[PDB]
Amino acid sequence: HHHHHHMRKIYIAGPAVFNPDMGASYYNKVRELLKKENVMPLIPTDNEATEALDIRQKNIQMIKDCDAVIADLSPFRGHEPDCGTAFEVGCAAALNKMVLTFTSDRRNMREKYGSGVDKDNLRVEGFGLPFNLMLYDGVEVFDSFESAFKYFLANFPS
Amino acid sequence: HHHHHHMRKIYIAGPAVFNPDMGASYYNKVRELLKKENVMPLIPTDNEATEALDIRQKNIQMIKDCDAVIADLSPFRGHEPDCGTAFEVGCAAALNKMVLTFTSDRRNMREKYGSGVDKDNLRVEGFGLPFNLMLYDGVEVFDSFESAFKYFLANFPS
Known part of the structure; x- marks a missing residue:
């Protein structure tokens, strides 16, 4: 009885602050x-x-x-x-x-930029990912906060 | 005689790769x-x-x-x-x-954008820093790779 209970915590990262x-x-x-x-x-x-x-x-x-x-x-x-x-x-x-x-735009970087280079001839990554590959760790890129949160609930139980 | 000698190492982060x-x-x-x-x-x-x-x-x-x-x-x-x-x-x-x-442009974000908001009325940080405050840890923002490297040599001796 009355063991410590951990309350789950999620850091809410993103540019909504702006x-x-x-x-x-x-x-x-x-x-x-x-x-x-x-x-x-x-x-x-x-x-x-x-x-x-x-x-x-x-x-x-x-x-x-x-x-x-x-x-x-x-x-x-x-x-x-x-x-x-x-x-x-x-x-x-x-x-x-x-x-x-998650992201509102799941298109490949090369689809977003429309080419393998940007307007200044700088290389656009070609790894079939929506953003800089450092930001991808193998977990599915979700369409919304809600779908990411569903993964959390399914994969980090109380 | 013949103790292990550590060779100093620096990770070279930046968009030069593009x-x-x-x-x-x-x-x-x-x-x-x-x-x-x-x-x-x-x-x-x-x-x-x-x-x-x-x-x-x-x-x-x-x-x-x-x-x-x-x-x-x-x-x-x-x-x-x-x-x-x-x-x-x-x-x-x-x-x-x-x-x-380091950066090629040391102006405050608000100087760079020319206002406290961007073209879409999103807030531009007002902390007298050249970029997102998460990227500033109290160490001087340098003007070049070379000036940053000089700090390394002065502060991380062999």
Whole structure:
């Protein structure tokens, strides 16, 4: 009786923070979905500090604390995912955390750019993947937060 | 006599790999500079595999093996650094490796975009930094590979 009970935690990585509402609508949808499953969202803007290094360190700690990262790798300011999100996925990979990714655009990079090179003759990756291959670890690239979360529930039981 | 001697190693992160020459000119300059100091460059395209996951794993291992990362965070396909490079910086951070960064453009993000929002009304960070704050750890942002390498030599002795 009354053993410690772990509450599952997911780090919510993605450029929704740059939305005019600072991610509110995105984070609210995440909160409502996770609440049903007794899963804690670890959100980048939670208890926000004022200094860049403090913000960064708190986010890195969230990744250390999490059971998984669900990362929004949707196009940000062009065809490439957000670099902040990419940094967070790298952190998670190094820490051997479950990393689940999604995007609004699942086309191959070469389909997105329409060629094997960009407008400046720089090479576009040709590995049949939607984004930089460093961001792919073998887990299916999902179509939405919701489909990534379903994988989490099926693969990280309470 | 004849104790093991560690050879210093630096992971060479950056989007030079997407150059028409696959980074040859960049990597050659790096090789020549490091050779003088008996430092090994760990280069992303070295002994390259054919499968995405193998390429990724070999690169992650280079980061595990390195004493530092020197990362090229120059604008890539716009004002944002390369996401592959950003993933590698996150990996290094999580592994407590020395991370040294440089860029060809040291202006604040808000100077680069010319406003507190981008063309789509998405927020541009206002922390007086040249790129996403996740990529800044308190070490000076350098102007070139060479100036970052000088910091390495001064701060990671043989």
